[PDB]
Symmetry: T
Subunit: 145 residues, 12 copies
């Protein structure tokens, strides 16, 4: 794969309770949109979601051996807690863009601390699922001349 999209814990819940509370959009809808968007630029894109920190770190190591040129990651809650994830990304030295659906600054003060943002190329928060599209747009421009 060329672009790898990673989703952290609890994102599999998007759409799954009370459609109005969070709308109808699902994690699979988001993935579909991104696959199609990368097919239109003739880029191979893969995706991965897990609630387990270990699997996400294993996934990043595998990305190195697969030739991935850029990670788009929504670490979800792990932004605030996971030094392991920081070190997996630095270790394999694949550039990444951090994405959040919601504005994390608008929430509890503990959510203003990150172990990832300072090492990301850039960060997009609060723009919903479209944040991933923009991230992908950026990555496509930067990867093909």
């Amino acid at each position: 794969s060329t672009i790898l999209v990673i989703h952290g814990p609890n994102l599999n819940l998007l759409g799954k309770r009370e459609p109005e509370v969070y709308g109808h959009l699902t994690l699979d809808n988001i993935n579909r949109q991104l696959i199609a968007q990368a097919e239109q630029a003739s880029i191979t894109l893969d995706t991965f979601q897990s609630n387990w920190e270990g699997a996400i770190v294993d996934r990043i190591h595998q990305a190195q051996t697969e030739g991935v040129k850029l990670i788009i990651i929504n670490p979800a809650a792990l932004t605030h807690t996971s030094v392991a994830l920081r070190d997996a990304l630095l270790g394999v030295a694949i550039p990444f863009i951090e994405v959040h659906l919601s504005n994390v600054h608008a929430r509890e003060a503990f959510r203003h601390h990150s172990y990832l943002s300072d090492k990301a190329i850039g960060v997009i928060c609060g723009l919903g699922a479209k944040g991933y599209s923009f991230a992908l747009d950026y990555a496509i421009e930067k990867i093909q001349p």
Copy 2:
């Protein structure tokens, strides 16, 4: 009606490291007592223990689909560290009670902070295994008012 009891990391060792350090009470004994208690009010009681954060997050997602009405959780050490667990409980919107056998306020200062307590119905700490029963008792009465 389903109630789910969740035990976090290291709670499997109860009873195992010496006859005396906090009892012969094992996790299995506790679980058996709570099972009996819940039968007597015709409540279905599930239990679950794991040392892996991700397994606990999965189990909570699973509870949403099972129509579990309330969660009694001893997150053990994850109380202090796991934002992912907080967001799992919030994401499924199943109300919960936090339980600890020991008094977390009597110990090191880093144990005074929690990512769950502020979102729990309530908290019971320091009353040993009976804390799980009290929480069950409370749950029984709040489900059939």
Copy 3:
């Protein structure tokens, strides 16, 4: 008496102001429940409430002369401010359980601090008036297995 229940300031308000705000349950109701629960096990139970910190300190000193084995205390606001209260309990060396009707951890940041919790056998918060019954059940069971 064998067991003393102490209520701190403002708890005399319970169930006076607009009985559809926070319910129709007085301190009186709680004390009645508790007295009966204690009678069932042949334990003499005393109760006390005051808005005056000095009155509560005097009452704790009197408990010492009366051979009180354990104190169940809801200090309300005093949990955050009264080292005099911590020192009265430690000075008489009577073990105590701390109880709050509401989840103190869900309120303003200043309510996260206590001058009592770290010396309590245990704490129960947020489970309403039932918190006191649970505390009494534990106490009965520790005092006479």
Copy 4:
């Protein structure tokens, strides 16, 4: 005058491109503005731009935006993000929603740059993606305003 989108650029962004092109590329504030105007006009959205090194001018500009019918502000406040409560209270006082943009990754720099008087009140924030950040915010704006 009337406009739907207002783009605000705070202090020092007029310097873009002008010191030693070697250092931080050849791209200028006017380049950025041209690109945003082209983009807006291509979606039939009216867009206006403003830059100043003076805080009170930016505040006046936001008050002016209220009487012009502006629906969304894309603001790169630059250094004012860390210091200007007045700016926050301007955006809030006129109740025009905004998106915050930074060319550079502000989390990658000094610790005093991690705090903002704006970010918590923004719809969202884009930092570190250079001039595309603005374009993405316009994108988002266009989709929210004319579905």
Copy 5:
């Protein structure tokens, strides 16, 4: 009275519990020694103890009307909490020496802060009952060189 000795909350417990392990010295023993020491110098000395903060503040007000020249105070736990007490002593402008039986720097970190010490002439902590005699000795020398 020329000199007034004030004891804050809980100090009435001294000598009451298991005196052979927690000391046999009582507050009354302390008061008797200070009174004899003051009679020796032909100084009139009074004493007051209360568990109630408002009683102590009232007593400090009354001291101004009685022409007390100096106060020796062991505020006990109130040293850490009572601004009211600081504004009582400052409002009547009667100089004071702060005394503690025990060394407060050797206990919990919250006991290292005081609302009185910065305004006291000086402090004696950790020398037992003699702390009071020493304060008295200093006071006698000051009032009549």
Copy 6:
């Protein structure tokens, strides 16, 4: 309609010590002025001062049973220390204006924090007794437009 004016500890010392030092105005003088302003508006006005926190809490509870529409409180030292006072005012749900004679921000750092100000309608500090009269003016306009 009653307004109640509460004065906290030490305010009884006003104008007693070297009236050349901090002024001639007494607490009774302040009360005389507020009663005149109230009577001029045909509003009933009650005043209360105590050095004891308990007396103040009880007084606030009584105000609830007496139909008091609004409280003007100068808590003096209690504004920095008394969560019980906060909870009494909130528990009776009578709105209130906080007054201080002096400018508390010009004094020691610990005097900058208040357990009341965030729940007051507003605060006046540093304008002497006129601060009370301003609060009362505001209150009269609020009750009888």
Copy 7:
């Protein structure tokens, strides 16, 4: 004599941003009312609003030239950020009263800090536009007793 009232940034919005949000009153209404009040007591009163820090600072420098006796200032957001403004007021040594329409202590934590309050005579917050009149009333009494 002259009093000068200064209004800081964004106060020009008063009234205009929806009657819905905070009452019907406007900055010019406030200024009109205050001119009338000063004319009544034979005092000259000038007014000034600006969104720019330097315009305010220049205005205060001019006030010294004009022999202004007292400044009534609503700095709005600048109370939290502007050391320039503090040093302007201190530099011309014109005493001032700080005024806010809303209760700053009831809002975000960053609005509890001021670079002015400690050097003001006093502060009035949360009483609406009456805060300005009370300030004038205080100022008239200071100037012409």
Copy 8:
């Protein structure tokens, strides 16, 4: 095994990405060296690595059941985040030595805090792979005097 070696997340990357970035040395070379070293002493040694925190907790539990006498652990990023790991080691009560390849104190401030260091026998950092041989040397001497 008498002695167990544990490597935390990301240590499997040693020697992979550009054998000139951090040399050619690999996690396998280290384990090789330590197994040989143990053999010379007639001590059985096991080794283990995982990116998943729960795997590491599980392996510590297993170690109790294997009679392991000492643990040499390089928790890597988990030293800063994992209370779960701390409580695993304390719960099985097996002494441990913490090892880090790099000087952890020379990097970002967040890397200076550890949930393990205070309960280790001791710590070795910054001495590359030899760190583990030294720990092993120490452990051999502790078990075979």
Copy 9:
């Protein structure tokens, strides 16, 4: 080789208020002193004062296009608050020396923080007007040995 001297807000008030407050020296005197010193060394020297942050930033930008080689800046109160000023000086990349008349370390704690000092060549404070001369001496010497 042109040097630019920038004086920040309020420095235009030097001399004005009661000449005995810190003597008679005015901003104009200072500029004349430095203009002469610059002419004696055949160095073009420009000066600038403003109370407006914006004008100062515009000034620094124009300094780039004018080929200014070094700036001597007394930012007065803006040292503590203006990130915009920092970013202007780094944006144009003109080295600067920071000067203060008074000892900023001997005043309020807020004056101990600066957004300029860490990026200046160095800093002189508390040496009165000679501070600016010393800076120009250093600057002259740097610019033409």
Copy 10:
């Protein structure tokens, strides 16, 4: 010697500078009072002052081999900075009383922290030279059965 008195840096200046500033009392006067006081009770008493930390530490190691039973130390400025001095006293395990002439709590905030006070038997501050006599008075009664 069974009692050693240590004076830290700068105490050698007592009396010296304008005896109409902080008295005519010198370090030697103090020593003399203490020596006579000790002689009256047939206890030998040694004294030592130095401005050098290492001399104080060496002096404490000596006292160990001299059978010194108690140290009375006024460490002066070292109480806030010297861990070496702390470790000396603890290393030799000679109990000590800390003395200061002035009320250290009435000064700068950095002066409230001590590396000694938590390990002293007790502390006396603010009572001038008599503080040393009081310490000695206690020490005599301690040493003697």
Copy 11:
């Protein structure tokens, strides 16, 4: 009229390890430039360097007995640690100017705090050896206008 220049620890190393890292200039050179400058103005100038804090303290005590009018001090590392040094300077009451060769603000955060700056007449940092000369120039002007 004598001036004393004091150099703290490590400044003896100036020029020693690779004249090609931090110039060829030595402490001797600086001292030479200063003795010359002082001669030109008929001022007597003493100099002193030590790696030992007590030696520097003694040298300040000596400066008092020799009638030294002003001290120019580069305390190097001791500016962040030595309150003994602060109190020597204060205790002898000789005015001082603080000097540092480098910009301490541009280095580690612990280097921002000083025990001396707040009490110095002033401070010069980052202008190299010329800072001592400027300090001397200021001192000469103040001793003999």
Copy 12:
């Protein structure tokens, strides 16, 4: 000397007399062991201990001039206090290894701060005397491949 070992204050106390310790081992015992290990490797090794900071700084300056390749330092208490020590090791630019006998992370919170750790090659703590041997071991390998 190719290698220099430095011991800081109070380590002279190791052995016989006892800083309340288990080991029986003395500072000379350690030194003999180290000299022997160094002779065996044909490497020359000097040692040094002092309770005087200044002496240690001097020793470090002398090491530059003696051609010392590497310093093994146990600074004991100085590791938390001494920036002069840090600046001496950086000044002479001799690489060092920091060694503590005890686990410094296991004791008081002030002991977790170091002014040396971040600039050492590495640190060993808690492994007693063997920590120094390990560090000698490492250095030997580094100086003689």
